[PDB]
């Protein structure tokens, strides 16, 4: 399903100054509502394709960009996922990941359902 193409849909959620503090929690972190507006109806070859445009939009949001230090800002500017804190990594999974809160319907592109998580939160892939 992550390798299948499709159309971005949904609203996202309002987000403050400690956005990815939620990434390791039960909920994970939501797609910021304003980021959600910029991706709606775009078509994606696979979920890896959505991931790149998402982090690019995050880098262009000053309120989100400043929640990262210099090296992570350079990554998201290039569409790469930021490094997660070392304690929140799992082996070679060093970077924040995009996952789904609830079952995907017949989907993977529903931005009400997409969560940013730490590798550790999503340890059992």
């Amino acid at each position: 399903k992550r390798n299948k193409p499709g159309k971005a849909t949904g609203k996202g959620k309002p987000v403050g100054d400690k956005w990815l503090d939620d990434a390791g929690k039960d909920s994970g972190a939501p797609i910021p509502d304003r980021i959600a507006d910029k991706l709606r109806d775009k078509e994606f070859k696979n979920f890896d394709d959505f991931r790149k445009k998402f982090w690019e939009e995050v880098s262009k949001d000053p309120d989100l960009a400043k929640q990262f230090k210099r090296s992570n800002r350079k990554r998201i500017q290039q569409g790469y996922a930021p490094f997660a804190p070392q304690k929140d990594q799992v082996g070679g999974r060093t970077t924040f990941e995009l996952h789904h809160d609830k079952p995907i319907s017949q989907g993977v592109y529903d931005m009400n359902n997409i969560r940013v998580t730490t590798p550790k939160r999503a340890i059992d892939i």
């Binding site: 230090k69 210099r70 090296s71 490094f83």
Partner: protein
């Protein structure tokens, strides 16, 4: 290349060049991940990749700041330091 076995085979200047290569981030993503993995292997610092991506507020977010924290932490924990070069 003369092979590195530990961080003590690096002069501080050589290690700063290595950290600047990482900070420059001109490599492929795969190469960048392998450079950070090697960085952690060499420093043995429990912060791991946090020295690069989640630096503490009380030093410079720069290769020089990273090398300074590694140098001070390793010395205080009775670990081997950098090779002395011809600056000494």
């Amino acid at each position: 290349m003369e092979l590195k076995h530990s961080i003590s085979d690096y002069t501080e200047a050589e290690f700063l060049e290595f950290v600047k290569k990482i900070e420059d981030a001109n490599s492929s993503e795969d190469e960048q991940q392998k450079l950070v993995e090697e960085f952690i292997r060499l420093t043995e610092h429990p912060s791991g990749s946090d020295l690069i991506y989640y630096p503490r507020d009380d030093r410079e977010d720069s290769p020089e700041g990273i090398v300074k924290e590694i140098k001070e932490w390793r010395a205080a924990n009775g670990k081997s330091g950098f090779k002395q070069g011809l600056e000494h």
